[PDB]
Enzyme design. Structure first.
Site, PDB file in Angstrom:
ATOM      1  CG  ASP A  35      -1.814   1.212   1.318  1.00 35.89           C
ATOM      2  OD1 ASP A  35      -1.906   1.937   0.317  1.00 35.89           O
ATOM      3  OD2 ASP A  35      -2.446   1.427   2.392  1.00 35.89           O
ATOM      4  CB  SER A 199      -1.968  13.977 -13.800  1.00 41.29           C
ATOM      5  OG  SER A 199      -2.281  13.663 -15.152  1.00 41.29           O
TER       6      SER A 199
END
Length: 330
Positions: A35, A199
């Site tokens: 994780d 992004s």
């Protein structure tokens, strides 16, 4: 040193991925959810409330000759999906794919919430975010990667998750045969303890690319892709019959649909998520309404590049002095 371990979907929908981890002496092998969005290594154990164990493999520290109770240490964690777990702490030897850390904090669960109990395939979590998020008190503990880092050939790990298929976590090296083209690296902020990056934009199917900054986290422990409502609405508008369902808790779509791809930007590079990766199957057994793999982050408070996005890429988690993230197509 290096390590290399295969990671396997827990079910036919890739609802999560498990990777085998050796704990203790002799080794006790548990299947953990790696994780990159949290920083605790915790396990179901011989200390876990019996009624809260239902099929998981447990760590029994009393049977490990290298286990030592970390005096006075406790941990307690709550995740974004509302689940939680807590307990005490041992140090022990932990190995992943041939890479060994001695003195690793292994957080033994005394209590777990129902979603953990109900998932017999996940024996615990192995956190790979930054150690500043580790919940052990009163003395915060380091992640497996942080403990291994100085010994690794290169201070990196990579995630290569498969679509409805196994994949690989590598530590200490970049497998240049595992991706196509080049790896594009992008800046990381560690201010929130995550692999947080921006992004450069997105496209839906064969549509034109929209240049727009999307700050989010690279999170292998989140199944889906969570993005701003505007982006998500633009995606699902291209699927006939798709709608946001308040009762189901997100966008659903007719199971008969053919889903368009979704592209996200990493610098000038582009990662294409095939449409099929966005199908999470019937909302309930036998339904012809299917759950979408791209969902709104509104009210999460952060965008999450979860498995839906990451499995479309070869992802480098670069733990150099100034961390960065790399993405390649594959």
């Amino acid at each position: 040193s290096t390590g290399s371990a295969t990671t396997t979907p827990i079910d036919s929908l890739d609802d999560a991925y498990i990777t085998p981890v050796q704990i203790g002496t002799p080794a006790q092998t548990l299947n953990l959810d790696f994780d990159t969005g949290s920083s605790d290594l915790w396990v179901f154990s011989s200390e876990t409330t019996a009624s809260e164990v239902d099929g998981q493999t447990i760590y029994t520290p009393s049977k490990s000759t290298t286990a030592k109770l970390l005096s006075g240490a406790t941990w307690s964690i709550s995740y974004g999906d509302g689940s939680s777990s807590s307990g005490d702490v041992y140090t022990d030897t932990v190995s992943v794919g041939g890479l060994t850390v001695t003195g690793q904090a292994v957080e033994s669960a005394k209590k777990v919430s129902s979603s953990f109990t109900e998932d017999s395939t996940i024996d615990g979590l192995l956190g790979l975010a930054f150690s500043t998020l580790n919940t052990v008190s009163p003395t915060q503990q380091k992640t497996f990667f942080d403990n291994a880092k100085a010994s690794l050939d290169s201070p990196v790990f990579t995630a290569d998750l498969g679509y409805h298929a196994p994949g690989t976590y590598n530590f200490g090296f970049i497998d240049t045969t595992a991706y196509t083209g080049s790896i594009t690296y992008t800046a990381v902020s560690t201010k929130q303890g995550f692999w947080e990056w921006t992004s450069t934009g997105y496209a839906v199917g064969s549509g034109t690319f929209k240049s727009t900054s999307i700050d989010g986290i690279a999170d292998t422990g989140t199944t889906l892709l969570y993005l701003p409502a505007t982006v998500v609405s633009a995606y699902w508008a291209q699927v006939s019959g798709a709608k946001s369902s308040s009762s189901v808790g997100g966008y659903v779509f007719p199971c008969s649909a053919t889903l368009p791809s979704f592209t996200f930007g990493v610098g000038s590079a582009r990662i294409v998520i095939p449409g099929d990766y966005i199908d999470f199957g019937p909302i309930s057994t036998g339904s012809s309404s299917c759950f979408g793999g791209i969902q709104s982050s509104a009210g999460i408070g952060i965008n999450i590049f979860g498995d839906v996005a990451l499995k479309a890429a070869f992802v480098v988690f670069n733990g150099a002095t100034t961390p960065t993230l790399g993405f390649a197509s594959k």
